[PDB]
Design a protein around this ligand. Structure first.
Ligand SMILES: COc1ccc2cc(-c3nc(C(C)(C)C)[nH]c3-c3ccnc(N)c3)ccc2c1
Ligand SMILES: COc1ccc2cc(-c3nc(C(C)(C)C)[nH]c3-c3ccnc(N)c3)ccc2c1
Ligand SMILES: COc1ccc2cc(-c3nc(C(C)(C)C)[nH]c3-c3ccnc(N)c3)ccc2c1
Ligand SMILES: C[S@](=O)(CC[C@H](N)C(=O)O)=NP(=O)(O)O
Ligand SMILES: C[S@](=O)(CC[C@H](N)C(=O)O)=NP(=O)(O)O
Ligand SMILES: C[S@](=O)(CC[C@H](N)C(=O)O)=NP(=O)(O)O
Ligand SMILES: C[S@](=O)(CC[C@H](N)C(=O)O)=NP(=O)(O)O
Ligand SMILES: [Cl-]
Ligand SMILES: [Cl-]
Ligand SMILES: [Cl-]
Ligand SMILES: [Cl-]
Ligand SMILES: [Mg+2]
Ligand SMILES: [Mg+2]
Ligand SMILES: [Mg+2]
Ligand SMILES: [Mg+2]
Ligand SMILES: [Mg+2]
Ligand SMILES: [Mg+2]
Ligand SMILES: [Mg+2]
Ligand SMILES: [Mg+2]
Ligand SMILES: [Mg+2]
Ligand SMILES: [Mg+2]
Lengths: 475, 475, 243, 475
């Protein structure tokens, strides 16, 4: 798309407002609105200003002013606003030099794609993502001097089988979902068919090419929708728009969605599996009929990179304290650093795709939706490329239920990290593969580390956990 | 129907979504949705993937990926979804070899039909089913360390005659159904006429050929709807679609349906009587004007097989712990292994059909709706075929009220099994008739036995029953 | 006899002390799911002319031949004996693994996972005895104590050898070794069935008579086994409402 | 005291019951009651039995039987029970060999005292302890699939200044305690004067020699009572009895006490400061008028041991997950490994005592009351003795407010450990100083490590924290 394409779209759709969007460092989209009458060439030539000091991971207060420049490829009609609105993503730029911002997640993705080309290894990295989520009815929580709580709730939650009535006083009609039992019985066990249909339709209407939708394993309304893969940057833009459409379709229909990794204890977490492949000149590079699981050397070394760099890479792919509550055995999330075909207990699964080279790819199962897809996809690529460049050999595939391994065998396999502080520590110690070609810079890495320590790790560490009262009140 | 018939139907009905369905081992339909735009030749040629490890009785996690291939004969428009949807049943296949899965219930029914043809005994097994159900208003239940409960409720339930008001605060207007008195007074005693009409209409609109609908014996909204018989596999597909339509028609109209065998204590259970007959080259094989109740030798030996194999066959026809609460005297369900014409106390009843050979058949009254109709119909066929093949003579018909037999004559007649663990034990010991022709395989039988022990028998056995408190609190 | 009279008076005193102080006591075997049941362990010994018969310093766990054969009787007759020592439907909810009640028919010293535990008592012959851990308080101590005695006496009289002691955690046995050890019965109807089939050891000397045994069997079937069997369990709704 | 002293006491006090007490591994006293008529010589000669498999950190089920032998020095009349009762502590012994149990905490303290004598360094280790606690009104908590909470409450809690009424509906009369403001205004600001007087009186009546009692810093009823120091084993027996008397005095007066390290967020935690000194032949060893803070070489090396071994020693002195919520800056608990005179921000404070050598001692401020005083005191002694034996020099004292240090300066002094798993890891790697003289054995250490990982560390790590919902619900 071009500037004129977007003006034509705005005029043809009789748009009243344009919503100007960009990504903060942690991974939440930010926006303000301008009237259609203020959406002109000047927006493309001069850009628009905002307060960089109010955005997380951006500027200090005395260097606050920042600039935004539009990305016409991202233009979509908003499905939700009563006043017709056109959404457009922007790149953040220095207001003096007009140089791209070093802490703009969209710029990182841009740099990753260009660095890929410059290596000669490939020209395109394709990402297909599966962002699972929960469709809840309610949530509340607080944290005080003398107490703390959370509660999420959902009509289909198994914890509600004994409820005398529903939240509105209507009768309990059963057909609630058992823990680990949501994947994927027909209605009325599946209570979210019509809502997920609306989500699917909203996505179709925003130009997504859809593949499937279904209830997921978790009780209390776990769900998954799949759309067509795309190249790195487009894929990360798609992810952000997808989360927006999912959350707001739920909202407009009286529900509340979360993408957090582990909202329920003793039921499945929500992952963001990333299917990845490299292509060059319109041809796939991942396939070799003679390799294990049909994998070429390039593919195997990419995996070698992911598994070798995992202890620091998870700082971007599993970036929250809650992430590490998902990385526990028995829930189809990884607990150790292995690859294996057909294996949903592994860190990297190779899906069964047959002899078609175009379909051959790896599924990185470790990542979740709790962070920044621009940074996450970029970091994965940089790990994989380091793997290829250094010919990093992964340890042998383990074609077993990785949660049921004998002690002697399990201990010869590197584990996933236990907690956020460990991966942040490791990122600080070893991040050279990310800085290759200036894709990630030290200022971004240092800001990230600092942000996670001060705003996440420390605040959780100093606050007493309710289960400590269960354990220790009577010491 | 062919692939092109289904594409034409999808296009003519302006379908937005296709719902991909298959059967788990215990007997619940599973589904995910794809857009109409993804429903193409590739769905027929390459199939679709799912996670076999999340489906009960299927795969382990390290061998998770499974494949689905469509069955065009099963294509129907969904009556419920606001976004126009086409439902299609699939067969489950190995993703490497594309071999039919040994634990796909739809495959077992396929295999049973082929085995029948290969014996030369007949070419067609027809099944007519009567799946009774209850239309409740509510249900709740739970199970904790210090207590446990269930409660079902229904406006027409006799337990509510003394209620001051209905659930919504409106007046009690009487005309509630007496225990064992629901079959079948006119409205207003029958409070479900309009709802059953809606169920009937939804079935007609999904291509069912309807025979009748009525209130059943049980208080609190017991019901029965009959549709035309069909050959085994088609009949099992019809049963699954029927349960879906009944449950969801109820759900959309503010009710809640259960097909469990015995939700009410001291009132009728819900059975799945199976009327069965064999045909060859378009001619019936069950009829002989000179036999007892018009039955041929072939028919009598089929019955011999059902009654001889019953102690293990009920593992598939009466597959739940709750099944055995229905097999008690006084409620038109069987308590012993006899056949008899006109006799609703018997295990096999021969309905009165006159001299028309095409109407001659046996009614197996033992089965209920708590399991898997693909496996249940197949197992019944295998038992009946073993009877024909071995010329198993049933014991003499007993034309009496089998609940009022003097202890002396009753002691000579074999009883129905008391509990699930007994039939599971017997299935394990003796299942050769099921494995004939590889219709059932040992892996299916072993998985079934193991599933029932670990997920049903044991969990119920270890949990104190509320009536034990009535009996023993004061010991 | 004195011990059975003591047991009845004890239950009365416990229940009523609780009652007078605003509480309510139950002796049922398993009132809580996922926590310990309540047993009635019976420590037993035979004496003659003021001297103990259970002790032999050379035997496993200090046990004489007389003691070992008594145990042989308890464990051999268990499938029918539990009809009097574990006489309720609720009894069988207690005989599950992980709660210091028995799940199989073995004896073993120091072992709270076993059916018969030999407590550690040292060299004093007067303290030597066996602890039968299987019984609970849900029945009749007069009949329970008597039945245990009759089983133990049949063991002595027929020199019934118990199978070898198993000094392990009987709940953590590998499926292989566990398959070789006889299990405790699963349910009341099984022990009642077995009592009906084989009760000769109880009728010795006319201690139990056939009228008592027949009345017992008939009572348990009609008033306990059948009434529980015909009533849907709440967990069946958890399992099957949505079938 | 002797056996006959105890019999005389029991007879003179007209005791009806004797309470038999011993310590489990984590640090909770266990008990059963025998009638006075069963308390005879046999209790001393033969001992009493119990089920070692029901006691945490003791026996497996197949080796369950354990033996108890009385310690006549510990006999005290119980202040609480209406039926007159004598409490006696016991040692746990092997029932075959009568050898002292290797996992009896009271045995470890016994061993530690003997090992001290055997080194020739000193013959007596004196411990003066300050076990702070909270006097709350209520507590509740739970942990479910979809939510979790705790709440503590106290009339004097600052969170209650805006309450319309008190819990019983009586008026809010103010005079509540500000956060960090409880040390130590007069009544009515101090609302616990009469209750602490009752606690003081019960202690005096159980033969404690009292020094002081006061409100402590924390809002919502923090308190401290001090009794006279003693030698190691007697001191640990005194601590256990003290906790019992405090808890039950509170209970009988309608309150609820906790000794947990950090029950309130943003207010003082509760420590167990341990004042320590070594004496030989009735003379003190800690004093040298020429040393910093009046400390001898022996004293300085003992401190060297404490600080050097701290990373593993805290596994016994700070043994819970909640312990590490107290080791945060700003609350008069340590955040780093320094000693300093007069300094309540330090790990080891040297109180100001003047020129009297008998009063010279070190205050180890790190420990809390959440574990086992027998093991805690013993472990501290072992670390100190290793310091003396190896002449470990502590780093120079730092006479500054350790919480106010700019971050670059703070980083130049070794920190206290962040979390329990770290000290448990370190204990596993390095514990030789504890095994000297067989005082701690490998079986105890391995059981401890194993208990903490399986029952505490892992269960807390897998459970989502309420503040994670505050941080991440909307990711
Ligand atoms: C038959 O030719 C193709 C070409 C590309 C294909 C791509 C996918 C694909 N789907 C997904 C999700 C949406 C299920 C996560 N990811 C991919 C994907 C992602 C990255 N690279 C490739 N090659 C495929 C799936 C099938 C394909 C088939
Ligand atoms: C007059 O010619 C016929 C031919 C087939 C007929 C089949 C039925 C039939 N109806 C039922 C239900 C729906 C009431 C359970 N089952 C059968 C049935 C089933 C299997 N085989 C046969 N022959 C009949 C009933 C009447 C028939 C009459
Ligand atoms: C004047 O002679 C002495 C002798 C011993 C003394 C002991 C203490 C003392 N008090 C405490 C608490 C109760 C406040 C924690 N701890 C000690 C203590 C503990 C261990 N060793 C010594 N020397 C003193 C305090 C003053 C002393 C004064
Ligand atoms: C069924 S699942 O394996 C579940 C994944 C799980 N929720 C996770 O935490 O990654 N996902 P998919 O089959 O869509 O890859
Ligand atoms: C009236 S009934 O006999 C009732 C059957 C009963 N509910 C059963 O449990 O099988 N059924 P039908 O007459 O439809 O065969
Ligand atoms: C501690 S326990 O082993 C518990 C026995 C358990 N309640 C039972 O059901 O037998 N009893 P004891 O040690 O008194 O013999
Ligand atoms: C006033 S304080 O310094 C407070 C100690 C704090 N509660 C702690 O957590 O160690 N105690 P003390 O003066 O009794 O040694
Ligand atoms: Cl962390
Ligand atoms: Cl059963
Ligand atoms: Cl039973
Ligand atoms: Cl920890
Ligand atoms: Mg998926
Ligand atoms: Mg998924
Ligand atoms: Mg996936
Ligand atoms: Mg009918
Ligand atoms: Mg009927
Ligand atoms: Mg019928
Ligand atoms: Mg006992
Ligand atoms: Mg103090
Ligand atoms: Mg203090
Ligand atoms: Mg102090």
């Amino acid at each position: 798309k071009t500037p004129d394409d977007v003006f034509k779209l705005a005029k043809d759709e009789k748009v009243e407002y344009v919503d100007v969007r960009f990504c903060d460092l942690p991974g939440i989209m930010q926006h303000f609105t301008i009237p259609a009458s203020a959406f002109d060439k000047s927006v493309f030539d001069d850009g628009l200003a905002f307060d960089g000091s109010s955005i997380r991971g951006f500027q200090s207060i005395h260097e606050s002013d920042m600039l935004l420049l539009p990305d016409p490829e991202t233009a979509r009609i908003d499905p939700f606003r009563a006043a017709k609105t056109l959404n457009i993503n922007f790149f953040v730029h220095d207001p003096f030099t007009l140089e791209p911002y070093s802490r703009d997640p969209r710029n990182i993705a841009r740099k990753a794609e260009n660095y890929l080309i410059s290596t000669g290894i490939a020209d395109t990295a394709y990402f297909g993502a599966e962002a699972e989520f929960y469709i809840f009815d309610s949530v509340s929580f607080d944290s005080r001097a003398n107490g703390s709580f959370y509660e999420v709730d959902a009509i289909s939650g198994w914890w509600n089988t004994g409820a005398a009535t529903e939240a509105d006083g209507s009768p309990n009609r059963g057909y609630k979902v058992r823990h680990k039992g949501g994947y994927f019985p027909v209605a009325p066990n599946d209570q979210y068919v019509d809502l997920r249909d609306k989500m699917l339709t909203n996505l179709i209407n925003s130009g997504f090419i859809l593949e499937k939708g279904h209830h997921e394993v978790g009780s209390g309304g776990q769900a998954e929708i799949n759309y067509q893969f795309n190249s790195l940057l487009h894929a990360a833009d798609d992810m952000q728009l997808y989360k927006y459409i999912i959350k707001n379709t739920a909202w407009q229909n009286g529900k509340t969605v979360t993408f957090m990794p582990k909202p329920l204890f003793g039921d499945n977490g929500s992952g963001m599996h990333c299917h990845q492949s490299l292509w060059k000149d319109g041809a796939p590079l991942m396939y070799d009929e003679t390799g294990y699981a049909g994998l070429s050397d390039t593919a195997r070394h990419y995996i070698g990179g992911l598994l070798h760099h995992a202890p620091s890479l998870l700082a971007f792919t599993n970036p929250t304290v809650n992430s590490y509550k998902r990385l526990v055995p028995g829930y189809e999330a990884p607990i150790n650093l292995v690859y294996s075909q057909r294996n949903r207990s592994a860190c990297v699964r190779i899906p069964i795709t047959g002899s078609n080279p175009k379909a051959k790819r790896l599924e990185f199962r470790s990542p979740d939706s709790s962070g920044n897809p621009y940074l996450a996809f970029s970091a994965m690529l940089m790990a994989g490329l380091d793997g290829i460049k250094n010919k990093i050999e992964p340890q042998a595939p383990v074609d077993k239920d990785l949660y049921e391994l004998p002690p002697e065998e399990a201990a010869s396999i590197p584990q996933t990290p236990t907690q956020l502080s460990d991966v942040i520590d490791r990122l600080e110690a070893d991040h050279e593969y990310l800085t290759e070609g200036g894709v990630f810079t030290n200022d971004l890495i240092e800001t990230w580390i600092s942000f996670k320590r001060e705003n996440e790790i420390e605040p959780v560490n100093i606050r007493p956990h309710p289960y400590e009262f269960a354990l220790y009140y009577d010491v």
